[model samples]
Target: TLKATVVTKKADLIELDAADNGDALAKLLANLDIKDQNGNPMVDSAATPNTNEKLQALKSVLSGIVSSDTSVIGSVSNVDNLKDDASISGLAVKKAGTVTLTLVFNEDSKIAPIAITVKAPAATQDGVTVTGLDLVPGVTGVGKTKFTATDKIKSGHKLYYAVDDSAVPAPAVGTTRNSTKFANEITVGTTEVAANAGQIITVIEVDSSDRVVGYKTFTVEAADLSVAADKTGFTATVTPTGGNQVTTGKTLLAVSDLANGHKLYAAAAGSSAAAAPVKGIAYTDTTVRTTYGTEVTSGTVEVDAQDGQHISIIEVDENGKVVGYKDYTITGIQIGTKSAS
Candidate 1:
C-alpha cells in the first residue's frame, strides 16, 4: 500500500512526504507503470533505475492533484524538479474568509479538506510634511506680501494658503477651506492683510481629493525698518524759480538717495532747526502741499517748495504705514552771476 501525508503546513506552503511504508513513492511509481528510457518499470530498491528519476516521476503525479484547483495554489511549473522533500507553494487567500482545500489521489481516495481562515490587511492613514513658511523681503509691496513654502518631503500633492487678520486654525482632515492654491510660493494681497498690516497666514498640503493632509501656520510680520534705517538722509539740489541767472526766489527741491517705495514731502515749518523725525506721522501740518508727497522708491524726486522750506523723507511700508523718516531744510542756494543754467 502507498500513502502521502502532510508534514508541514504554513500560510504560503504545504510540504508532503511518503507514508504507510518505506520506499512507498518508489513502489507507487512502479505500480503506476512509470518507466525509464530502457522501458524498465521503477522499482523500490536503489538498483537499476536512477533514484532522482524516480522522485521526478513521483512529483509529476503530485502535480496532477495540485493542478485540479489553481485558485488556492499558484501555477508551479517547477513541480517536476522537486527533490527529496516535496513542497507546494504560492497559496493565496483573498479577503477575510475561510478556505478549504481537498487533496485527491487516483480519483477514488482523498485526504480530508484543510480549512484556513485569513484576515484582510488594515487601511492606511495618509500624511505629509511642510516647512519654511516666511515672507520674502523687498519683494513685498503695499497691499501685498510675497510668501514662500518649502515641502520637506516630496509628496506630489497640491499646496494651498489662507490669510486672515486673526489666527487661522488648521483645517480638519478631509475638510477643505476657502484658500488659494500655489506652487511653492504665493503673494497674498487680501484686503484684510492690507488693512491689518500683520496677520496670520496658513499653508496646507492636500491630496487629489482636496483633503487636508498637513498644514503650517505663520504670522506675516510688519515691514522691516532696518532696510529703511540702512539708508542715509537725502541730498538736495535747489533750482531758483527764475532760472540760474537770478537768485533769492521760489526754489524747486531736487532730492537724492531716496530708495524705492519711499516718499519725500516738503513742508514749511517755523524753524529750519534740526529735530528727531517722529515715526508713523507727517513732520508738520504747515501747508506746502495739501496731499502727501509723491511715492518714489528709487532715484531722485523733485518737490515744489520754496528754498527755505523744510523737507522730510518718509519710508512707507508695504501697507502704507510710515516706519522711518529723515528731516532736511532747504537752504544754501548759491546766488551766482555766472549763469550756469
Candidate 2:
C-alpha cells in the first residue's frame, strides 16, 4: 500500500501522472523524444532500456531544481510583527496615519512573503517638532541647567544640527550669534563663537521667521587641563605658558607673551564642597580678577597678561552667591643677559 505525501513541482518530470502502473510508466518512457547534451533530438533509442534510464535521470535533475533552486520563493518583514496602527520604535502620531512600512528579509532564506492589500486612515497635516533636544551634548534648555557634565562643547569647535519633523518645510540649521537659549533660535552675525578651553557657554538668537534657529549650547572642554577633577570637588590646576614647570621661577616663560596654563572648577552651588550634591550649581557669574579675560568659572583658561601677572577667578552659584575662587600668580620670562639694565 502506497500513501504518498507529495509536493507539487511546476517544471517537467513532475509527479508520476499515473501511479502504480507499469503500462503508464512504459508509455511515458517510450513516448519521451527529448534532446541530448548537443541539443539534438533522440530518434534511434526510442523504445530501449537505455531510453528508460535516461528518462529517470532527467526526472532526477528536474526534481533537484524544483527542490533546491535558490530563486525568490518567499520574503518577510516586521509589518505583522507590530500592528498597523502601532507606533514604530515608540514614536507615533496623534491620529492613525498613513505610514510606508519597510520590509526586511534574508535573500539566503527560502521564506515566501504573502502580499496583501492594507487599508488604513490617512495622516493629518504636518508640524515642526524636535527630538533628542533635551539630552543633546553642549546645549542648554530654557530655564534648565546643562543636561550633563559630560555633554560638552569643545574649544574652538563647531557643530550643526536641525530639529526633526514629520513633514517638510523644516528649519535650516545655521550659525547662532548666540547659542545659549532654545535650540532653534538663531542670529544674523557670525554664527560661531570662538571659545576658550573649558568654557561652557550657550548662545542663541531668534530667527527672522520668529522661529528659533542656529541655537548652540556647549562647554568648551579643558583640552589643556587633562586631569579633570570630579564635579563634586570643584578643583582645578594650571599649566603656565612657555617652559611649564610645577615650581615657581623654574617654570620659565618665552621672550614673547603667551597663554597661561590655567585650571577652573565648578560644581552644583551648595554649602558643602566635600560631598557632591545630586544637582550641580549653574555658573551665574564669573569674575577674572587681577587680570583681563572673560572666560572663566570652569574648565581651562589662558592668562592674558605678559608680565608677572596675578590671576583670580570667582565662581558664583545660580542664586547670585559666591561659591569659590581660583587664584594664581603666573611668573614671567627671566632676563638671560640683562639687556641694557
Candidate 3:
C-alpha cells in the first residue's frame, strides 16, 4: 500500500491543515513548485514524483497564488499540497548592545530585524612621552629637526615640549622661531623642532601666548659629532666660515693667495716635510672652480684670480666634487646639484 500526502491551495499556505503527509507532498513538490527563475521566491514546478520535506517547505509559501485549476483534490480545489508552518512563537531577537546586526532569513512574514542599540566606550588619545633630551643625527635637506607626536591630540589638554638649547650658540628669548606656520605655536598644543638626528631637541617653550615661549619639547635621541666617522677611515672637520683647511692633516692651501698654476704641498699633519705624508697631493687643481658665482662644493677647482673661472682640470674629484677638500679649501665646488624652485 502507498502512503498519501496532503496537497492544497490555501492563500495562507502556512495556515494549511495537513492531517497526514506520507510522501505525496514531497513527490508533488519534487515534480512541481519550489523556486523561481531569479532563484528568488516562486513556485517550483520541477519537483520529483515523491512527497517529501522540500515540498512541505515549498507549499508553506505557495499561499494559493497560483490558480485557475482545481483538479488534484477530486471535487475540492486544485490544492495539491496542504500544510501550515507552526506559528512562529517568536523570531530570534538580538540582545541589547548590538552595534551591528544582520537579519538572517528575515523575509516576508518573517520579522528579521529588531533594534537593540548599545553605547560605546569613550576614546583615549594615544600618546608617548619623549623624555631624556637627546640629539638627532643630521639628516640631509632637513634644515631643522622636529619633535612631534604621530598620534592625534585631544582637546583641553595643551601639550608642553622642550629641548635643551645646547650648542655653539644658546638661543635667547627671541632667537628661536618656528619654520612652519604657527609652527612653533599651536592651537592644539604641539611643538615641532627643526634639528636633525644628532641635533639635541630642546623645547624652548610651549604656551598660547608665544608658541615659541614657555612650552617644553622633549628630545628622543642623542647624536654627537659633525662628521659621523666609520671604520673605513672617514675624516671630516667643521670649517665654520673663516677659511677651510684640513685642520689636523698636513693641509696644502696654495697659500690662499692668487697665483695662476701655483702649487705647494703641505705635509700631512702627521708626516714630516721630509717623509711628507703629502705624497700624492696635486699642486694646483689647475681645474679652477667657477660656479659663475653659483659655487656649491664639488671637486676642488682652482679659482683663477685671472679670469675667475672654475675648472675641474688638475686633481682628485670624487663623485664629481672636490676630493679631500678640507672645507673652504675648495671654492665654488659643485659636489651636488640644487633643486630649482
Per-candidate TM equals 0.33, 0.17, 0.20
Error of 2 at 301 (Å): 22
Of the two candidates 1 and 3, the one with more favorable lDDT, higher being better, is 1
**Best candidate per TM-score, number?**
1
Candidate 2 lDDT by residue in tens digits, 189-292: 21333334545444322233232232444444443112211323333333444332223223222212112332233222122222211122234322212121
Q: What is the C-alpha lDDT of each candidate?
A: 0.39, 0.28, 0.26
lDDT of each residue in 1-341, candidate 3, tens digit only: 22112222322221111111211232233233333334443432346434344434543433332211222111112234354244111111111111321112213424232222211111111121223333332221123333334444333233333334452221222112334322333322122344444444333332222222222433344332122212122133222111233222122223332123322222211111111111122223231222112232232322221112222212222323222322132233212223321
- TM-score for predicted model 3 compared with the true structure: 0.20
Cα RMSDs, all models: 19.1, 23.3, 25.1
Give lDDT for model 3: 0.26
lDDT of 1 by residue, 1-341 (tens): 23332211234322211111111122223223344445554434546333444544445344332333343233335554334443222232211122233322333223233222222221112333445545644322234455444644445556566667765454434333334432233333211223235677666666655545556665666562113321234332323223464433334344444446555543333245233332433333232124333443433333334556565545554444445555556554522223333
Candidate 1 global lDDT: 0.39
lDDT of 2 at 217: 40
Using lDDT as the measure, name the better of candidate 2 and candidate 3.
2
